[PDB]
């Protein structure tokens, strides 16, 4: 049976991102915005069941649970063309419509309030799945609601499906734009915590890199947050294409994340894509050379992930899963990974066999690709912790200053203390230590408290 | 050739001066027309192109969603002894996986030809050893999809299915380990056992999935597409038969299903067996770690609940038993990690030797399998042959 | 028409005559690290991939015949091969036969040539004798480009060295002037070979191929083209070729010395190291100037005794500013 | 990979010159003003990566950095057709918009204030370049902002790509005309200083020489400031052609200047072009002969550097490379060399090897050539010292008079003293002396 993926939509921004992700998956699988297979979608070679569930023999319904503390986004989804894709019983909107006030703790309390609906949606999607692989949580790290609700959804998916894989698409906040959400670092820390502890694979999409690309290539002086979020959703889609487009290998979510996630604790993945082009720039058939492509991939302005400079950890690849979209020959993907190894773009564990898995899949005929050749790399690299460690440190810096905490004190999770923030910081620290351990032969013992205490001394 | 084509259609679907040349051109033209008519009859009556497409979808693993769903459904069944497998049950599982995957969208004429075959069940056999896809060829299409061609296609199907089954078993082991890490966060001493299980399962999944990818795409899918293109471009029935036979032989060789690749096939089978062993060891380690984590969590929950009720959270006997259980779990975690590391190292050695043989194999698909198995150059660090094969031959042909 | 002789010939010009400078730039950028290894240490896969990158990277990807372009690693360096060939029936034949093949692992830079796949019936015209002449032209241009790239790298490295230590700038002036004499020399030799030999002989071939009456005329014109390019590139004179080889070897040794010194200064007895570097540069300058004066003298000799009017062009290019004129008179 | 050139645009005049240079380079490479490859650019023999960088997989952006101390020029660039050519992260505009007040020191201080943006621009262009050779700074020496900011950009270009060669096309101010910018001689000195210290070869573009070329060769009676900027951009194009048009030799900027620059100090180059035509003067296709080309290139009236007619000093070229494209008769080349020798129209260096390198390339289909046969010369010529020596003398004359120093004292670099102007004048004097030495055999010991 196909490996179904349950989509968890958290908060206003997260729910919008999840809706656009489900729209993109439907477009790639030829599913209409109403959840009905189009009459023209006769090429039954796509794996819709990876990301969508069938409600009947003809109707594919997204395995999506919409949870928000503000009603505006949920109403916009129910007012969108994709209103019929989602189960209406799987859409939770807070009656008060007030949102989480950009408070991570408020978002967590809202997730707790919508816990029943979201977990009922996830369980309903899993029971309709013969071999449900797991849940995918879609959320924003910059708001208040989407981060806490996403962490709640990840926790409940881990609790309910302890033998199932949990992949996450974790959007990192843009670092070049001034976020109006001053408490964003707490939300980002909680989301990175939940991805580290309760997800099996988290593809980090740093909006900062999206903004940099918008600035340098589109000549946009001030890249908006919306363009960065759409780039992050595109990156997550590209990283999940091998799960959503079945092929010879890595045709299932557990198979997709197995090659990407070497250890259960070292589950913080970094992504890279090349060549990167903006949707608007299709106009200029650029004579990009192979040399220019490789140099641009190494150029931070063209890479869709802004990984921090971790100075403490000799970051290496723990595991790599390559999701290739388009016309791909398995031998060509293998040669490409080999060339990456020759350039030492990824260091692998020395104590066991590890590689970049390559799946060859046909492309969707319905989706126009702006790039003649594209590729996504998913890798677990300790340098992704530098983003998460920095988010955790900023969260702790805000909590120690009680900045924007008045919005969180309204929610029960933060009424008495800020213990949820400290637990998030500890989870991100354990993730950093495990990712550093995953660079070492001792990765067999990664995530053991003795290694966390040895990397924190 | 003309009379042969006529017989195939029936059973399966200047003269005064230079007599020798007066009819030669006419004989050749008539031969061409009769052969073309025979090939068209064979195609229209035996659906040769449709049989080739069915072979591609099922036996060449072209319906990758179908193969994925079959392997996922078989994983809990194929780990069991084959002596408990029912061929009817395996076919029902295949049909269920089809209905649960994009295989349900295949045409009824194609889907009816894709089936699950169970080999003779022996004790101790896994599903990977007995599961195969088959494609029934008959009539005129059986002239192109001969019994040899069908056997080669079924061999490639079974090999890809076994590799995918082992990959999915190891992926399920690693998924269980990763998910239980969330549960075992409250039991950090047990987390390392789960991580070791995840690492071993990830290595085994990588090996098996790379072998399956090579077989199904570089060998099976490409040779099936070549067969279909040649049949569509075939000028006669004998040309179609020969082109399909050559395609099937190419698929067998590159999927290691031919007679000459038998050593490569044996090395790939040993790699798959070591990957399955690693997967099973990792799944057992992760199961033990998750059970220990669940017991620790239940003990902590009972303690907290008794404290909330104002009772002494744990009795001294119960507290000593809980501490003993946590100690035993922590002491088994290093042991589980060591066992998973040993299994991973054995699997990696077997995979490296298989990759070396594949890189030395004449089949290009095997070279692609070697390149995929060592994408991070782990096997290339362990198997010299994957590094040497690409470097040595190209310099020699450049010196003339 | 059916064998597209002119299209194949244009492909040969694009690849073998280094007409596609952007192609050669891309190829040498991708392959320089792999070709710098000993031929035994070179991975042929990397050269084929760099070739494919250069093919895909150049405007030759629009060439329908680009796939006929191959990488060829010659068994001997071009200079030893040409000296052995020219020594045939010469007094040097015995000296080349008794010349131990220098244990210098032939570098890919010295072994690199193109080959060109010509199918029947076009294999009648673009035969191995033609392809080998194209390979010789390719390897010659590739080596000239290697020497140019080395002189430019030494230039850049010296410009960087001038930026790190203001005080070292006086010591670097002599290395700069040696590099500049080598660079002007290398560029003028490349210019002669490209625009007066390869380009003129190709234009003559295309005109003669346009005037061919039969396939044997086309073959004759192509052979005459290759022989003209070979003649005018100084490849047929063993003494000039041997002096040019020594000059290029001295240029490469100078560029390697300057690069090592600039790298050392960037990473960084120092006065001793600087005096040793200056002494090495002055020794390279002396050797280069001696070989250049011997080259100009030989060109003048062949121009006067052998009526090789083309050799006067080499001299005028080589001494366009009269830098060697007083030295030639001396 | 092509040898990419990063363009540094400084101040109003410098930014206009840079914009026109990038436009001309795009036209030669068939790049639209929007960064799209033009359909007419089918001759894939041009190095677009030399003048443009790829910003993404589809958009080619000119490697141009727009730096001004006054917001007017930066806004005009962002409102120009080249707005999409420049990386928006590579555009630095001073928030105060006040400019440098025609003060070289103020322009330098603004460059120091915009140092981060400029070096970020250089690094972004270098990372987008597979084989970045270096940065070329286009600016005017006569204003306040474009000279100082150009020197700042040159310093930051050397700092950011310190292992890469940096050639500059530095337009020096006219020293014989009274500049309305009283601090222009200081600005000219600062530009010559930066060219001497951070460039390996500096082609001096004298706006007086640009006007002379427009009058005598382009038949432009009154060259506009826009025409002077276009002449400077043409000079930069001619000096960078060997980087932008790959051939058998001189395929990189360091390789191109290596043959031209014997010593680091003797880096003051003069340029000449023939036939020189104004954009308006395209109508008359002058049948220029090789003799006429060589004579006009060697003629100061058509040369993009205004050297005085020194009758006493035999000023000479250190090296000259003429790339000639089109129909050339060998007998005409011979007659041209004969006439040049008889008229002594070009003196060459006596102290080192120098020649005219010739690479044969097809012409761009996208760039209209006004001449049936055209040629560019890039040369290092000691007569550029006459421009640099005059700029240095004028700088010293202004600094000794504290002329226009009040505008510089507003900026921190000149608040306490004008020592930067005097150091610039001294550097320009040393550059002039070294360039003059390069005409003599004793150039081997120049600067000792």
Author numbering:
A (entry chain n): 1 to 457
B (entry chain N): 241 to 253, 277 to 663
C (entry chain M): 533 to 800, 838 to 899
D (entry chain m): 1 to 448
Mind quoting what the paper says about this structure?
The γ-tubulin ring complex (γ-TuRC) is an essential multiprotein assembly that provides a template for microtubule nucleation. The complex is an asymmetric cone with 14 “spokes,” each comprising a γ-tubulin molecule supported by a GCP2/3/4/5/6 subunit. We found that the C-terminus of NEDD1 forms a tetrameric α-helical assembly that contacts the lumen of the γ-TuRC cone and orients its microtubule-binding domain away from the complex.
Gratifyingly, we also observed a pinwheel density in the new 3D reconstructions. Focused 3D classification yielded a clearer NEDD1 pinwheel density map at 6.9-Å resolution. Our reconstructions confirmed this CMG module persists in the presence of the NEDD1 pinwheel density. Notably, both models adopt the open γ-TuRC conformation, based on γ-tubulin:γ-tubulin distances and GRIP2 domain rotation angles, relative to the “closed” rec-γ-TuRC conformation derived from microtubule end-capped reconstructions. Thus, CDK5RAP2 and NEDD1 can simultaneously bind to the γ-TuRC, and NEDD1 is not predicted to significantly affect γ-TuRC conformational changes during ring closure. The pinwheel also allows CMG module formation on the γ-TuRC—at least at position 13, explaining how NEDD1 and CDK5RAP2, key γ-TuRC attachment factors, coordinate γ-TuRC localization and activation at microtubule-organizing centers.
